[PDB]
From a paper:
The human genome encodes about 80–90 DUBs, of which the largest of the five DUB families is the ubiquitin-specific proteases (USPs). All of these studies suggest that the inhibition of USP2 may be a good therapeutic approach against cancers. In the present study, 6-thioguanine (6TG), an old drug still clinically used to treat leukemia, rheumatoid arthritis and bowel disease, was identified as a potent USP2 inhibitor. Further studies using enzyme kinetics and X-ray crystallography to delineate its direct binding to USP2 were performed.
Although repeated attempts at crystallization of USP2 in complex with 6TG failed, we finally succeeded in the crystallization of the USP2 in complex with Ub and then soaked the crystals in the presence of 6TG. The crystal structure of the USP2-Ub-6TG complex was determined at 1.8 Å resolution. Fortunately, some residual electron density like 6TG molecule lied on one side of the catalytic triad of USP2, while Ub is located on the opposite side. Nevertheless, the structure indicates that 6TG has polar interactions with residues Leu269, Gln283 and Tyr558 and van der Waals contacts with nearby residues Asn279 and Phe573, while may also show a possible covalent bonding interaction between the sulfur atom of 6TG and the thiol group of residue Cys276. Unlike 6TG, 6MP lacks an amide group. This may explain the ineffectiveness of 6MP against USP2, as there is a hydrogen-bonding interaction between the amide of 6TG and the side-chain oxygen atom of the residue Gln283. Interestingly, binding of 6TG leads to movement of the β17–β18 loop (residues 574–577), resulting in a 3.2 Å shift of the residue Asp575 toward His557. The binding of 6TG also leads to the movement of Asp575, an absolutely conserved residue playing an essential role in catalysis. Finally, the irreversible inhibition of the enzyme by the inhibitor and the slow-binding inhibition via affinity labeling suggested a possible covalent bonding interaction between 6TG and the residue Cys276 of USP2.
Author numbering:
A (entry chain B): 1 to 76
B (entry chain A): 264 to 376, 386 to 599
């Protein structure tokens, strides 16, 4: 199936994924297109940040859903 | 009064910034003050009840203090890091990331719990009821909306539509700006017609092959509280860096009617809170600017200091999260 990621500057990318794909796998797929290290990526869907060790199915993510890519502004 | 500062526990101003924004979220504050969460709380041991309890106690303490009192969120922090171990340390953290994990925690603890024949609006309504039978809480009452995403094959013209809930919107920042980049320019970049071609061609289910497609967001349901997260991040594949572009956002009469799936008189917002970040991506300082629900006056909440401010001081390039309420 295909899902989408709204990336950092206005564009969208298309990913080929399976429901059983792990969040880490998705992040790797995004790295392959965007060049952003998985450990820097945060992916938001339906108000949840997707966690490593979980799968797309775990989150009821269906075909043509969009993931929102954001990074971090670390502060104290 | 609600003008109590929060003690910095060690790089925790990200957490304090968000806490003050939520403290000034009128309906969320009232929920805590009027103790309405008590009957919503789940029963059963180690269903993270202490998170809601400690969050509500903190909001109660803030709104019963004398101005310039300093409140300690140490008990609260114990609870949030148990819910979300990434916040275990005393390291610098992202305020958005913190917001998402916090609201998820609170929501979980007071939770009250194909279509090709249907016109778009009916499909959305059905997807929405399907969602609300899984996620139904006072926290959702405030923050949750619904996006519509329409994906059109440029070859056969078939348009597939899907509906995604959201609890906030993360907006790309316009690089342009005639005089200045505006919040409306950023909302336009979010909702624009995205071309999916070359490497990004989707497979068309009708054409049975990869085709150039156009993808477009609109807002199917607006939330009571609209949180807008500015994507202040560069595209560097080496050293990512912060985008410090000034984004001009309004204090009043943010009308998002044009981004709606269907014309509405009830998508006008007023600003009430801003979480500000000063720094780079690797480190920095968070503050909050918030409008008291009672008095309508703005204050800066900074490193336990709480100071009055003018509405003319609210817009800065350090704005990172904007909290808007349905007017
Ligand atoms: S450290 C701190 N304390 C309060 N009350 N508010 C803040 N906003 C951003 N940082 C802080
Ligand atoms: Cl982009
Ligand atoms: Cl995988
Ligand atoms: Cl992550
Ligand atoms: Cl219990
Ligand atoms: Cl930077
Ligand atoms: Na959700
Ligand atoms: Na879509
Ligand atoms: Na137990
Ligand atoms: Na779609
Ligand atoms: Na980057
Ligand atoms: Zn087609």
């Amino acid at each position: 199936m295909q899902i989408f990621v709204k990336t950092l500057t206005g564009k969208t990318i298309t990913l080929e994924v399976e429901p059983s794909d792990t969040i880490e796998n998705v992040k790797a797929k995004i790295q392959d297109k965007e060049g952003i290290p998985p450990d820097q990526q945060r992916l938001i869907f339906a108000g949840k940040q997707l966690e490593d060790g979980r799968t797309l199915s775990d989150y009821n993510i269906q075909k043509e859903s969009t993931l929102h890519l954001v990074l971090r502004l670390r502060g104290g | 009064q609600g003008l109590a500062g929060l003690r910095n526990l060690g790089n925790t101003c990200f957490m304090n910034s968000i806490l003050q924004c939520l403290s000034n979220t009128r309906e969320l504050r009232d929920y805590c003050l009027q103790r309405l969460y008590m009957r919503d709380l789940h029963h059963g041991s180690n269903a993270h009840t202490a998170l809601v309890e400690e969050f509500a106690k903190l909001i109660q303490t803030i709104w019963t203090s004398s101005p310039n009192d300093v409140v300690s969120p140490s008990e609260f922090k114990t609870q949030i890091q148990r819910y979300a171990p990434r916040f275990v340390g005393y390291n610098q953290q992202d305020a958005q990331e913190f917001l998402r994990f916090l609201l998820d925690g609170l929501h979980n603890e007071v939770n009250r719990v194909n279509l090709d024949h249907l016109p778009d609006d009916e499909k959305g309504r059905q997807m929405w009821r399907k969602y609300l039978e899984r996620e139904d809480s006072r926290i959702g009452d405030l923050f949750v909306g619904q996006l519509k995403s329409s994906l059109t094959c440029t070859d056969c013209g078939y348009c597939s539509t899907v509906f995604d809930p959201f609890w906030d919107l993360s907006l790309p920042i316009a690089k342009r700006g005639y005089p200045e980049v505006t919040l409306m320019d950023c909302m336009r970049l979010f909702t624009k017609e995205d071309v999916l071609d070359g490497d990004e061609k989707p497979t068309c289910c009708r054409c049975r092959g990869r085709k150039r497609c156009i993808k477009k967001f609109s807002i199917q349901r607006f939330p009571k509280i609209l949180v807008l997260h500015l994507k202040r991040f560069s595209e560097s594949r080496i050293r990512t860096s912060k985008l410090t572009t000034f984004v001009n956002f309004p204090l009043r009469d943010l009308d998002l009617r044009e981004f709606a799936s269907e014309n509405t008189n009830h998508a006008v917002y007023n600003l009430y809170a801003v979480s500000n970040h000063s720094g780079t991506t690797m480190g920095g300082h968070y503050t909050a600017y918030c409008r008291s629900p009672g008095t309508g006056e703005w204050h800066t909440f900074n490193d336990s200091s709480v100071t009055p401010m003018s509405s003319s001081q609210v817009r800065t390039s350090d704005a990172y999260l904007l909290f808007y309420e349905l007017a």
